[model samples]
Target: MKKLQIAVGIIRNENNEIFITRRAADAHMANKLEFPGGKIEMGETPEQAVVRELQEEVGITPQHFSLFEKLEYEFPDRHITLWFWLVERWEGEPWGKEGQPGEWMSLVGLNADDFPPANEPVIAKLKRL
Candidate 1:
């Protein structure tokens, strides 16, 4: 199985709604709802990866972000380790940088079934806040 490390950001706006994006139509877990983030690069910390990914994928620079949780999941063909971060403050408007679809939705309105199984724990934890 292929092992991968990813950094995911839950970017909350001033209104308290969080930014979300959809996976590419051809990507793994295609068209699924997801936060804006990507792979952690060599020599980069998870935090650094989150900042860069947010900038690259959503055109935002997080001024204040913190790790919310870390979780690992295994698919039939791959294993993934994820660092989930909470982005409380940032610059620039959030949008899909690569033409992927996205939107802002309250955590209360999110359904765990819309995301990958690995995200259920994160969603459950966030709803408590």
Candidate 2:
């Protein structure tokens, strides 16, 4: 399987609510909730890809954050290794820039059942971190 590097942003608001976006109905993870991010493009560092993805997907420029975790998964066609960041301060409120619905959810209110399978373990790690 080919290997892919992706960057994910766990953006939190002043209320401590995390930001999640729904994948489009036609997307691979349709109806599943995920952190805002995408593949790391050529010539872009993981951090740069996360920042670019943040702006492209949620219209935010993250100014304060910490790279707290990394997750790896293997699928039949590809392997994914994701760099996850915990972001607290960013410019602008999140809006669905790519036709996905954006939601600010309290971490305490998150339902693991509602997130994409790949995100489950990541969320679990977050709870302990």
Candidate 3:
């Protein structure tokens, strides 16, 4: 079993829109939309990864953070764990520094099916927000 874990951020602006980015066309689950984050590096905590990834990919350093939800998924090739953080305050605007398209999703209009398959349950959780 391939085990992997990462920290993700759910950035909600004042209008209640969440930030999401599309996976590059060459990446796994190509063209799928997902949250901003990356794999946790060795010796680093999830919180640390959260800060690093948000800055690397979104150009924003979170000033606030908290739990949102977590999801575990199994695939024929790998198992994955995702830690979602709720980031309400940040220092800069986010854009697709990775060259992937970024979009703001209105919470009330959010749809899990609009993203990668691994995000099904996570979207369900977001629906309750």
Q: Which candidate achieves the best TM-score against the true structure?
A: 1
> Which candidate model has the greater TM-score, 1 or 2?
1
Error of 3 at 29 (Å): 1.7
Native-vs-model 3 lDDT? Answer: 0.86
lDDT of 1 by residue, 4-116 (tens): 99998999877768899999878999889998888999999898999999999999998778889999999888999999999988889999887888899998898989998
Order of models, best TM-score first: 1, 3, 2
Q: Give residue 5's error in model 2 in angstroms.
A: 0.5
Candidate 3 off by > 4 Å = none
Off by over 4 Å in 1: none
Note the Cα lDDT for every prediction shown: 0.90, 0.85, 0.86
Tell me each candidate's RMSD, in Å, in order.
0.9, 1.4, 1.2
Q: Which stretches of model 2 miss by more than 4 angstroms?
A: none
Compare candidates 1 and 3 on lDDT and give the better one. Answer: 1
Root-mean-square deviation of Cα positions for candidate 2 versus the true structure, in angstroms: 1.4
Model 2, 1-129: lDDT tens digits are 689999989998777689899887887667888999999999999889889999999999987688878889886677898898888888988889887788888887788788866778778876664
Per-residue lDDT of model 3, residues 66-86, tens digit only: 978888878677788889898
